[PDB]
Amino acid sequence: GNPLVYLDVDANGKPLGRVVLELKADVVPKTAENFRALCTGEKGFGYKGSTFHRVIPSFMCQAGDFTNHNGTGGKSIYGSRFPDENFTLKHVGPGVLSMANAGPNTNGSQFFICTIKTDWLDGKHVVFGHVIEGMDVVKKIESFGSKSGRTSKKIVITDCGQLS
Numbered sequence: 718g719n720p721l722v723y724l725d726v727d728a729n730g731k732p733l734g735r736v737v738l739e740l741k742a743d744v745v746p747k748t749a750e751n752f753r754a755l756c757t758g759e760k761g762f763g764y765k766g767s768t769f770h771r772v773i774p775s776f777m778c779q780a781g782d783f784t785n786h787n788g789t790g791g792k793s794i795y796g797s798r799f800p801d802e803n804f805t806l807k808h809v810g811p812g813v814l815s816m817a818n819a820g821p822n823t824n825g826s827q828f829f830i831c832t833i834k835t836d837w838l839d840g841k842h843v844v845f846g847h848v849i850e851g852m853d854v855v856k857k858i859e860s861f862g863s864k865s866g867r868t869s870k871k872i873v874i875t876d877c878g879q880l881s
């Protein structure tokens with residue numbers, strides 16, 4: 718079946734717990750595979766040690782810039798950027814996992830987890846999974862955001878990987 722992956726997240730050096738994500742490889746195999754491999758680190762790079770750098774309460778929590786840690790960087794397992802696979806899955810509510818981008822066909826490694834329905838992103842960001850377990854952890858992360866996106870605690874993915 719579809720991959721299950723995890724992110725273990727610290728805030729100011731203390732553990733919040735684990736977010737478990739299902740990746741919809743049935744719908745978006747290329748996008749799911751990128752995220753899966755960045756979680757395991759099997760290509761020699763990935764999410765381990767990187768941050769949630771942009772967090773906006775009542776919107777989303779964004780992470781995955783493991784090169785610049787500020788929202789300008791990241792890279793995929795295919796190359797620096799890759800196309801929008803499809804827009805078949807929608808931003809239906811809290812827990813949606815979707816690719817951050819800088820316009821059409823600029824997926825790399827940055828991603829976000831929604832804390833509300835974000836319907837205006839449909840057709841612009843590729844949705845590729847959802848939170849299976851750990852929305853409590855996501856709500857903690859969310860609570861350390863601000864309107865500007867600046868975080869009030871240092872939010873770090875200390876460990877990540879594949880469960881199945």
Ligand SMILES: CC(=O)c1cccc(N)c1
Pocket residue numbers: 788789790791817818819823824825826827
């Ligand atoms: C600025 C830039 O290159 C960027 C920003 C957000 C997501 C991604 N994949 C790239």
